[PDB]
Design a protein around this ligand. Sequence first.
Ligand SMILES: O=C1CCCN1Nc1ncnc2[nH]c3cc(F)ccc3c12
Length: 167
Amino acid sequence: VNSFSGYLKLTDNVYIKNADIVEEAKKVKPTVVVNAANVYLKHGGGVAGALNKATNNAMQVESDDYIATNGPLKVGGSCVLSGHNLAKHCLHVVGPNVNKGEDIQLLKSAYENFNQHEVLLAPLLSAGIFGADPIHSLRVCVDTVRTNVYLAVFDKNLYDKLVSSFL
Ligand SMILES: O=C1CCCN1Nc1ncnc2[nH]c3cc(F)ccc3c12
């Protein structure tokens, strides 16, 4: 038993809710919140900008030190950093950004990072400003992630579409 509330159960291990991931994280304090990161951990907009804003820019300060030490992430890769006031940890995962011409097949690799964590609160990778089809992203999630994932979808219209079309 865990504290996630109001989710629709899609599969054995995948759950979905129309919610603002920032508000959900603040209320749940999950062990892991996933960020929709880029390879430079520049959290300027989308989910990343919202999560970073909710940390009062502490996520960005920590991220800049991470990059200065380690260099950029790989597309499809991830790193674990602090969850600040939102979660114990933030798993920064880089899905491919279609608006940069990145290969979509990397989306499966991106989701594989979730399997290193027993339970996660997450957005749909490569959705939103990353330009992928969220219905495809949901399919890859269900077919790749084996750990327990609670997906927060900000847009109510999109949430209803994802549910209604789910196979
Ligand atoms: O809806 C979708 C589907 C693909 C990613 N994505 N974006 C979010 N998904 C969940 N929670 C979110 N909170 C936000 C706050 C913002 F300012 C901007 C975007 C989001 C967001």
